[PDB]
Design a protein around this ligand. Structure first.
Ligand SMILES: *CCC(=O)Nc1cc(-c2c[nH]c3ncnc(Nc4ccc5c(cnn5Cc5ccccc5)c4)c23)ccc1OCCO
Length: 264
């Protein structure tokens, strides 16, 4: 439908690099829609050129453009050339992982718990849309303003350290495996961006989980918060919390944040 703009190459301009990796490159730039009198700051993700589908691509992009939730990034436009370029609003404070690392000495309990609520709200919305994210992590949450974050990079180097055991062993991905990744994401935030299982080879992680070991209790977390994170990492997928429950629980904690996180 009319939710997704097919952009002409003249309608957007790459100005600065925001970041790059094996996926491709993201640029800060401007969207200059034809016949309008406006220049809109945007991010442009240019995927690496694929050797191998235009109808199929527009079909997936149409889904990314149809999400309508304050905590889920929405695709604004696409440009199909030798490459796929995806355009969305600029999120000026960057990814939440780097934001929490850079600002750790200045982040208090209310901020942290609000982020947990907002991420759970976005994932519950994706679940309501029958969309499984498959790569939720603090690096894939973007910061529009310090207390408005949004999930990105659904619909698009396997992220073993964020994966539910059944995803590692059987390539099963469900909303309940997303809940596992949500637990890991909360752990990243509560450790001010520490690396999960730091220094442990990816291929060792399944034996850690099989033995019953989990990521450790972050110093600032009271047992009530850590218990929620542990429940996200149950082997039985159906015994993990639902995102709806996570919203309610983190919303309750956000109402009395110093009862739940202990931050010097
Ligand atoms: C945590 C490290 C990191 O990710 N660094 C990083 C940040 C950005 C970045 C900074 N400000 C931004 N504003 C808006 N978008 C992005 N990135 C981004 C992410 C996903 C995108 C983008 C365009 N299209 N997609 C996919 C998508 C869009 C909408 C819905 C679903 C999916 C733009 C941004 C950029 C690059 C960065 O580094 C990358 C390697 O670490």
């Amino acid at each position: 439908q009319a939710l997704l703009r097919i952009l002409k190459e003249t309608e957007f301009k790459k100005i600065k690099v925001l970041g790059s990796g094996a996926f491709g490159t993201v640029y800060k730039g401007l969207w200059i829609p034809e016949g309008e009198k406006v220049k809109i700051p945007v991010a442009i993700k240019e995927l690496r050129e694929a050797t191998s589908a235009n109808k199929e691509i527009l079909d997936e992009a149409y889904v990314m453009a149809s999400v309508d939730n304050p905590h889920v990034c929405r695709l604004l436009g696409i440009c199909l050339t030798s490459t796929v370029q995806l355009i969305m609003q600029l999120m000026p404070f960057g990814c939440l992982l780097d934001y929490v690392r850079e600002h750790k000495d200045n982040i208090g309990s209310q901020y942290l718990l609000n982020w947990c609520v907002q991420i759970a709200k976005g994932m519950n919305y994706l679940e309501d849309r029958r969309l499984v994210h498959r790569d939720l992590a603090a690096r894939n949450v973007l910061v529009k303003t310090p207390q408005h974050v949004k999930i990105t990079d659904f619909g698009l180097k396997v992220p073993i350290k964020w994966m539910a055991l059944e995803s590692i062993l059987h390539r099963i991905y469900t909303h309940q495996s997303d809940v596992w990744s949500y637990g890991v994401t909360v752990w990243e935030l509560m450790t001010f961006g520490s690396k999960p299982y730091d220094g442990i080879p990816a291929s060792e992680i399944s034996s850690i989980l099989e033995k019953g070991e989990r990521l450790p209790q972050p110093p600032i977390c009271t047992i009530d918060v850590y218990m929620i994170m542990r429940k996200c990492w149950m082997i039985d997928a159906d015994s993990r919390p639902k995102f709806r429950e996570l919203i309610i629980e983190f919303s309750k904690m956000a109402r009395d944040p110093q009862r739940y996180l202990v931050i010097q």
